[PDB]
Each structure stands twice: as C-alpha cells, then as structure tokens.
From Swiss-Prot:
Organism: Homo sapiens (Human)
Gene name per UniProt: DHX8
Cellular location(s): Nucleus
Residue window of the full protein shown: 260 to 355 of 1220
Top-level lineage group: Eukaryota
Family indicated by similarity: Belongs to the DEAD box helicase family. DEAH subfamily. DDX8/PRP22 sub-subfamily.
Protein name in UniProt: ATP-dependent RNA helicase DHX8
Described function: Involved in pre-mRNA splicing as component of the spliceosome. Facilitates nuclear export of spliced mRNA by releasing the RNA from the spliceosome.
Origin organism lineage: Eukaryota, Metazoa, Chordata, Craniata, Vertebrata
Self-association state and partner proteins as the record states: Identified in the spliceosome C complex. Interacts with ARRB2; the interaction is detected in the nucleus upon OR1D2 stimulation. Interacts with SRRM2. Interacts with CACTIN.
Expressing tissues: Expressed in skin, cervix and nerve. Also expressed in the brain.
Record remark: domains: The RS domain confers a nuclear localization signal, and appears to facilitate the interaction with the spliceosome.
Residues of the S1 motif domain: 13-84
C-alpha cells in the first residue's frame, strides 16, 4: 500500500543521538537512541578525528558517554555511524561535500 513515515529504521544522511557502550582498541560502539528498533553501530578509528594520526579511542570516547553520530549507510544487520562528521557540540552536519564509495 501507499504509506511511508519511516521510523523503525534509521535514515541515511540524517543525524541521530547515541552513546558509547564498548570502547574497542580500534573504534567504539555507539548505540542509537529514539528509534524503536534498537540499533547498535560501530565507529572506526577513522571516524573520530580528521585525516591524521590517532593514538587510541580510549581518550577519544568514554564508556557510557553520550555522543552525536550520523547514519552513513544501513543494510540488513549492518548500521554505520560517523562521529567526526557530526560536531560534538551542537550536532551540526560537518559534511559539506561527499561522494558514494561503492554500490
């Protein structure tokens, strides 16, 4: 039937609020809030700081700390999230330009 109002699943390009549940030596798992369907994504070490040299995620994020991330792409049981893209102040979109990677 003709009906949308998507909500259960996250929207690509949109920003959402989350929190770090597990800090991995590489990245950190951030759980999304609000959405009905509990979604848990992971933030690679490349999605923390700008093109440079990152020491460790430990200092980058804490356990049970509230953070703002953006829905990069959603596919089946795979939910991506970006932190550096979402300013950790007001949650503004720090992505003026971007191009797909693979289809």
């Amino acid at each position: 039937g003709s009906s949308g109002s998507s909500g259960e699943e996250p929207t690509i390009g949109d920003i959402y609020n989350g929190k770090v549940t597990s800090i991995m030596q590489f990245g950190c798992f951030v759980q999304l809030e609000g959405l009905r369907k509990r979604w848990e994504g992971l933030v690679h070490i490349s999605e923390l700081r700008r093109e440079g040299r990152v020491a460790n995620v430990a200092d980058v994020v804490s356990k049970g700390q509230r953070v703002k991330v953006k829905v990069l792409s959603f596919t089946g049981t795979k939910t991506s999230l970006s932190m550096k893209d979402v300013d950790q102040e007001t949650g503004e979109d720090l992505n003026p330009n971007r191009r797909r990677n693979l289809v």
